């Protein structure tokens, strides 16, 4: 009963959709969010309605939501932006404001969580056009950005940015034009999962993989389940990666919201349907994974006809946790007062510096 969805609680942010989130061993960072409901979205107190220009964090050890009071210039593209975590920094690229397509983003912002600071990268070269819904990845210390519509016309470029020299370039090698897809990688190839236009959703039984070495695209036919079949075609889903494994969760094809979760092995290309169904099936949500191997899911749209959002947060264990993680969870559950003791008291107890930093 460990690989099931468990709803967390403990002031939680209002319901939002279109946001993104990333996770490390300590906190879950949530950026962006859009909610058109006036009463739900903090009323007149939210000066950026219907956009959530707030960066939140969930503390795993204490189960508390903290809204960061960062400085600098928070980017205005708060819907369908792309966010990644590199070391102790958040890299934000793309996205759109409101109304959709009126003002998109094509630059890169960086936020240091430890310093809690915002800045803009001074990258030079031919940058991608202002797009949203694209997908990025970090491979070999370089940024790969693919897809994303410009608002009226779709894109298929595979731009690459060198972070060491901060140099932009376009990769010239074909997959269909799509947006709100997902990216997987293994250091040699980049795999496209899901996505689609506003009138169709592309099937996941065939995957387009771009080869960095050969500089050409290829098509891979994934094997199906034993008696379940391929995952249903979906867009606006969520994807996480653990070693050579890719987990797809949520999304919808246009008329039905899917609340299942699937796993694909990047070596044998075999699909596995995990026996877990969401308590509330959502799309356009955000999902993230921790180095331990726990997946967190937040936000999204619950009803496709009433256009109802949610603020429920769920956690699930995708792999067998390490003994350190199991002991940590049991100790935190058994003795909630541990968070109140100072660092010296915990050191006298015997906890290492890293464990204290995670707890405190």
């Amino acid at each position: 009963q460990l690989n099931r969805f468990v709803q967390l609680s403990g002031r939680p942010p209002p319901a939002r959709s279109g946001h993104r989130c990333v996770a490390d061993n300590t906190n879950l960072y949530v950026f962006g969010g859009y909610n058109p409901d006036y009463d739900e979205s903090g009323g007149p107190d939210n000066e950026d309605y219907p956009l959530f220009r707030e960066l939140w964090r969930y503390h795993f050890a204490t189960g508390v939501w903290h809204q960061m009071g960062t400085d600098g210039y928070m980017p205005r593209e708060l819907a369908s932006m792309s966010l990644v975590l590199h070391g102790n920094n958040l890299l934000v690229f793309g996205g759109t404001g409101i109304p959709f397509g009126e003002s998109n983003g094509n630059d890169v912002h960086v936020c240091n969580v430890k310093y809690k600071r915002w800045a803009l990268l001074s990258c030079r070269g031919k940058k991608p056009s202002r797009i949203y819904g694209q997908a990025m990845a970090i491979i070999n210390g370089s940024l790969y950005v693919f897809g994303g519509t410009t608002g009226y016309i779709y894109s298929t470029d595979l731009h690459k940015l060198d972070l060491n020299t901060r140099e932009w370039t376009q990769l010239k090698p074909l997959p269909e034009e799509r947006y709100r897809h997902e990216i997987a990688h293994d250091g040699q190839r980049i795999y496209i999962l899901g996505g689609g236009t506003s009138w169709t959703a592309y099937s996941l039984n065939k995957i387009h993989a771009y080869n960095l070495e050969t500089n050409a695209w290829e098509e891979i036919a994934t094997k199906p389940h034993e008696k379940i079949g391929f995952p249903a075609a979906r867009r606006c889903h969520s994807c996480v990666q653990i070693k050579n494994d890719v987990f797809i969760c949520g999304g919808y094809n246009g008329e039905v919201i899917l609340g299942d979760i699937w796993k694909l092995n990047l070596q044998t290309f075999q699909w596995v349907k995990l026996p877990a169904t969401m308590p509330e099936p959502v799309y356009f949500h955000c999902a993230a994974v921790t180095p331990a191997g726990c997946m967190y899911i937040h936000g999204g749209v619950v009803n496709i006809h009433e256009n109802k959002r949610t603020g429920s947060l769920f956690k699930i264990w995708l792999v067998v946790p390490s003994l350190l993680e199991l002991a940590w969870e049991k100790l935190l559950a058994a003795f909630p007062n541990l968070a109140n003791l100072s660092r010296t008291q915990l050191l006298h107890l015997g906890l290492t510096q890293g464990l204290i930093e995670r707890l405190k």
Partner: peptide
């Protein structure tokens, strides 16, 4: 082409 909703972004949310």
């Amino acid at each position: 082409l909703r972004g949310g």
